[PDB]
Design brief:
The complex is a heterodimer of chains A (about 250) and B (about 375). Chain A has about 250 residues and is an alpha/beta fold. Chain A has a single domain (about 5-245), classed as Rossmann fold (3-Layer(aba) Sandwich). Chain A has helices spanning about 35-45, 75-85, 90-100, 110-115, 210, 215-230, 240, and strands spanning about 5, 15-20, 50-55, 70, 100-105, 115-120, 125, 135, 145-150, 155-165, 165-170, 180, 190-195, 195, 200-205, 205. Chain A is globular. Chain B has about 375 residues and is of the alpha/beta class. Chain B has three domains: about 5-130 and about 180-245, UDP-N-acetylmuramoyl-L-alanine:D-glutamate ligase (3-Layer(aba) Sandwich), CATH 3.40.1190.10; about 130-180, no CATH class; about 250-375, Alpha-Beta Complex (Protein-Tyrosine Phosphatase, Chain A). Helix content of chain B is about 25%, strand content about 20%. Chain B has helices at about 15-30, 45-50, 65, 90-100, 215-225, 230-240, 265-275, 325-335, 350-355, 370-375; strands at about 5-10, 35, 55-60, 75-80, 105-110, 125-130, 155-160, 165-170, 185-190, 195-200, 205, 250-255, 255-265, 285-290, 320, 345, 365-370. In chain B, the strands form three sheets. A nine-stranded mixed beta sheet of chain B has the order 2-3-1-4-5-6-9-10-11. A six-stranded mixed beta sheet of chain B has the order 12-13-17-14-15-16, sandwiched between helices. A two-stranded antiparallel sheet of chain B has the order 7-8. Classes of the chains: A alpha/beta (about 250), B alpha/beta (about 375). The interface between A and B is medium-sized, with 35 and 27 residues. The complex binds glutamine. Glutamine binds near residues 30, 108, 111, 164 and 165 of chain A. The PDB classes it as ligase.
Chain lengths: ~250, ~375
C-alpha cells in the first residue's frame, strides 16, 4: 500500500510535484534518505507543493502520477528482498524512464536500475533491467574515499564520498554522471562515475549527494518542473534561492 | 581453573549492558547480599573478576562462545542488538551459537524486538516488554531499520511502537506478531524531559534522567530479579539505591540562563534526544554542535537520518549551528523548515557560549557529539 511519507504544509504554491520514494521503507541507510528532504526543500523554494509517497514492497508504481523518483541505497539483505519484488515494477519504471521521467538513484538503487549486480560473495542478483549497465563483484576490497566529478554537458562539478564493493560498467548508450577528477567512481578504470541516461541520475555518492551539491538538487527539481509545466516557465534563479547552500 | 560455586547470569547485547548489569547487581544485593560482578567492560579475562550465592557478568558478544566452554550459566539476557558504523544477524547468531553450548539455561530477551522471535535454540525463552495499550496498526517512520517480518519477509506494522523498531509488532500477511510477554511494563506513568515513572509487574519504578530508551534498561534489570524470585518490594528498595548509574542531567547556570548539555551519537540516539526535549514544558534555545572524527563518527551524513524535522513543532526561538562541521549542521537545520533567519551559524564555540549568555530566552538545550561536548565542557570559567 502506497502512503504519503511527507508533504508540504498548505500555502501559495504555483506548482505541484509528486515524488516517488522507491522503497524508502527498506533502502534507508547511510544518510541517503536525506536526498528526499533536499528535494522537498528545494522544490518548495521554486514554488512546488511536494507530496512524497513511499512506493515499496508489493506496491505499484504509477508511471503517470510521479514527477521525480528517488531510489536510495540499503543493506545487502534488504536489497536482495527488493530484487525479488522488482519484476512487478519493470514495465512501469521503464515507461517512466523512457518518457524522460526524472530519477535520482544512489548506490543500491543505481545498481538495481541495471541488468544485475554481483554481491561481494559472488551471488548474481538480477535488477530491473530497465537500463543497460551491470555491476560486478569485488571480493575483499572497496572503493572507499573522497571524490570529485565533472559533467561536461552542464559544465557542473559534483563532490562526494564513495564507499562501494561493486564495480559498475555502463553500456554504449549511457554517459556517466561525470568524468572523475579524483577518486575511483564506477569501477577500477577511474574514468567515469554514476550515470546520466535521460533525466536518470545515478551515482555512488554519499553525503548525501544533494546536501553537498545544491546545484544537482536544483537541476533535478527544475528539470522535473519544466517537463510538467513546459520549458518556458520562469523559476527563481539558482543563486537567488539557494544562496546559503553554495561554496 | 575456575569456580562454579555460583548461579550465574550473563548480560550481552549491543547497547546498554553496563547499566543493565550495574542495576541488576544493586537490586540483587538487596536479596542475596554479596553479588559477584565485573567492573567496566570484560572478555575472557574475567577470571580475575571471579577471584548459595549469585553472579551477574557483562560479556562481550564475541567472547561469549569461548567462555561458555568454561562456565555454565543459568540465565542469558540480551538487552537488544542494533548495528553501528549485514552485521546484526551475524552477531545475533554468534550469541545464539554460544547459548547452544548450555542447553540447561533460560534465555531472557527483549520481546519488543522482532529479531528475537522464535529463536532457533532448544532453550526455554522468556520475554520482557512494554505491554501498553494497542491501537490500530501503523507503520514505523521510514528511516526505521529492521522492519521485515522474520517469517513472511514482508513489512511489519506496530499496534504500538516505543522507539526504533521496538513495540507490539505485527505482519498482516504471515500473521507473525510480538509473542506473549513474561515480564510486562504495563503502564508508562510519567515521562518528561527529566524523569520517567513506569509500572512493571505491579510495582512503580522511576528514573531521574528521562529519554525513553533507558526504561528498557530498567525493565531488563527488574525482569532478571523477577526471574530469580525477588519480591517487587525489594526490587524497588535496591533499585533506588543503585539508580545513580543513569546519572543526573548535567545542567549549567550561565549567569542568568539554565543550559542543559546532551549527547548525540547516532540517528536513533539523536532522535531519542529530540523526542526528549520535545517534552520540556518551557521555551528554549537549541544549539547543535557537530564535530567529525573517530569518536563522533567520521561521516556527518548520519544527521540526515536523525529526525530533526520535529523541532518545527517545538517552542524554539533561537538556534545556533556550531562545532567543526557548523556548515553542514546549519544546512540540516534549515531543511526542517525552521525559520532560516533564526539559525545562527557559528565558527567558534566561544561565540556559541556567548550568544547563549546574551540570549533573551531563559533555558538553553545544547545537543553535541562526544568531542564537541568535551570541548564545550571546557567552561573553565564557572561550572
Ligand atoms: N552502500 C553503498 O555505498 C553501495 C552498496 C552496494 N550494494 C555495494 O556494492 O557496496
Amino acid at each position: 500500500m502506497v502512503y504519503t511519507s511527507l508533504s508540504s504544509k498548505d500555502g501559495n504554491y504555483p506548482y505541484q510535484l509528486n515524488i516517488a520514494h522507491l522503497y524508502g521503507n527498506l533502502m534507508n541507510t547511510y544518510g541517503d534518505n536525506g536526498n528526499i528532504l533536499m528535494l522537498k526543500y528545494v522544490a518548495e523554494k521554486l514554488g512546488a507543493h511536494v507530496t512524497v509517497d513511499i512506493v515499496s514492497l508489493h506496491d505499484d508504481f504509477d508511471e503517470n502520477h510521479y514527477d521525480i523518483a528517488f531510489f536510495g541505497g540499503g543493506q545487502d539483505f534488504e536489497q536482495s528482498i527488493i530484487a525479488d519484488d522488482l519484476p512487478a515494477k519493470k514495465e512501469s519504471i521503464d515507461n517512466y524512464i523512457q518518457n524522460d521521467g526524472v530519477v535520482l538513484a544512489i548506490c543500491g538503487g543505481f545498481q538495481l536500475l541495471g541488468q544485475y549486480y554481483v554481491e561481494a560473495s559472488g551471488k548474481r542478483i538480477e535488477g530491473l533491467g530497465v537500463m543497460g549497465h551491470y555491476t560486478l563483484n569485488q571480493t575483499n576490497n572497496r572503493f572507499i574515499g573522497d571524490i570529485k566529478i565533472h559533467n561536461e554537458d552542464f559544465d557542473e562539478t559534483y563532490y562526494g564520498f564513495e564507499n562501494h564493493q561493486g564495480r559498475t560498467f555502463l553500456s554504449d548508450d549511457q554517459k556517466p554522471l561525470g568524468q572523475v577528477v579524483y577518486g575511483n567512481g564506477n569501477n577500477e578504470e577511474k574514468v567515469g562515475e554514476g550515470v546520466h541516461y535521460k533525466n536518470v541520475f545515478g551515482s555512488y555518492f554519499h553525503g548525501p549527494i544533494l546536501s553537498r551539491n545544491a546545484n544537482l538538487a536544483y537541476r533535478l527539481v527544475t528539470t522535473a518542473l519544466k517537463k510538467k509545466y513546459g520549458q518556458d516557465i520562469q523559476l527563481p534563479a539558482y543563486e537567488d534561492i539557494l544562496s546559503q547552500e553554495i561554496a | 581453573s575456575l569456580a562454579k560455586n555460583y548461579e550465574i547470569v550473563v548480560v550481552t547485547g549491543t547497547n546498554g549492558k553496563t547499566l543493565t548489569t550495574a542495576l541488576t547487581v544493586g537490586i540483587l544485593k538487596e536479596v542475596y547480599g554479596q553479588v559477584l560482578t565485573n567492573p567496566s567492560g570484560a572478555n575472557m579475562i574475567t577470571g580475575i573478576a571471579t577471584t548459595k550465592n549469585i553472579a551477574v557478568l557483562e560479556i562481550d558478544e564475541a567472547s561469549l562462545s569461548r567462555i561458555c566452554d568454561y562456565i555454565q550459566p543459568s540465565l542469558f539476557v540480551i538487552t537488544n542488538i542494533f548495528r553501528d558504523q549485514g552485521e546484526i544477524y551475524t552477531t545475533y547468531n554468534m550469541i545464539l551459537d554460544a547459548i547452544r553450548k548450555v542447553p540447561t539455561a533460560t534465555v531472557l530477551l527483549n520481546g519488543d524486538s522482532p529479531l528475537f522471535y522464535k529463536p532457533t535454540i532448544p532453550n526455554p525463552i522468556e520475554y520482557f516488554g512494554f505491554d501498553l495499550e494497542k491501537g490500530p496498526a501503523q507503520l514505523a517512520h521510514y528511516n526505521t531499520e529492521g522492519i521485515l517480518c522474520p517469517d513472511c519477509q514482508g513489512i511489519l506494522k506496530y499496534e504500538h511502537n516505543t522507539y526504533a523498531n521496538l513495540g507490539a509488532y505485527i505482519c498482516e500477511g504471515c500473521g507473525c506478531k510480538r509473542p506473549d510477554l513474561d515480564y510486562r511494563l504495563t503502564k508508562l506513568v510519567e515521562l518528561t524531559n527529566n524523569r520517567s515513572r513506569f509500572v512493571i509487574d505491579g510495582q512503580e519504578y522511576g528514573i531521574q534522567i528521562g529519554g525513553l530508551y533507558n526504561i528498557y534498561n530498567a525493565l531488563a534489570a527488574v525482569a532478571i530479579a523477577r526471574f530469580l524470585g525477588a519480591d517487587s518490594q525489594l526490587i524497588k528498595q535496591g533499585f533506588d539505591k543503585s539508580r545513580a548509574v543513569f546519572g543526573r542531567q548535567e545542567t549549567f547556570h550561565i549567569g542568568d540562563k539554565e543550559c542543559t548539555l546532551v549527547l548525540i551519537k547516532n540517528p536513533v540516539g539523536a532522535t531519542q534526544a529530540i523526542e526528549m526535549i520535545k517534552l520540556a514544558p518551557y521555551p528554549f534555545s537549541l544549539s547543535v554542535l557537530l564535530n567529525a572524527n573517530y569518536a563522533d563518527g567520521i561521516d556527518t551524513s548520519w544527521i540526515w537520518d536523525a529526525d530533526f524535522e520535529q523541532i518545527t513543532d517545538m517552542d524554539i526561538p533561537e538556534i545556533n549551528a556550531g562545532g567543526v562541521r557548523h556548515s553542514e549542521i546549519a544546512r540540516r537545520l534549515r531543511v526542517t523548515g525552521y525559520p532560516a533567519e533564526k539559525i545562527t551559524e557559528t565558527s567558534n564555540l566561544e561565540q556559541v557560549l556567548k550568544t547563549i549568555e546574551n540570549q533573551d530566552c531563559k533555558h538553553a538545550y545544547i545537543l553535541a557529539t562526544y568531542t564537541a561536548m568535551l570541548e564545550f565542557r571546557e567552561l573553565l570559567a564557572s561550572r
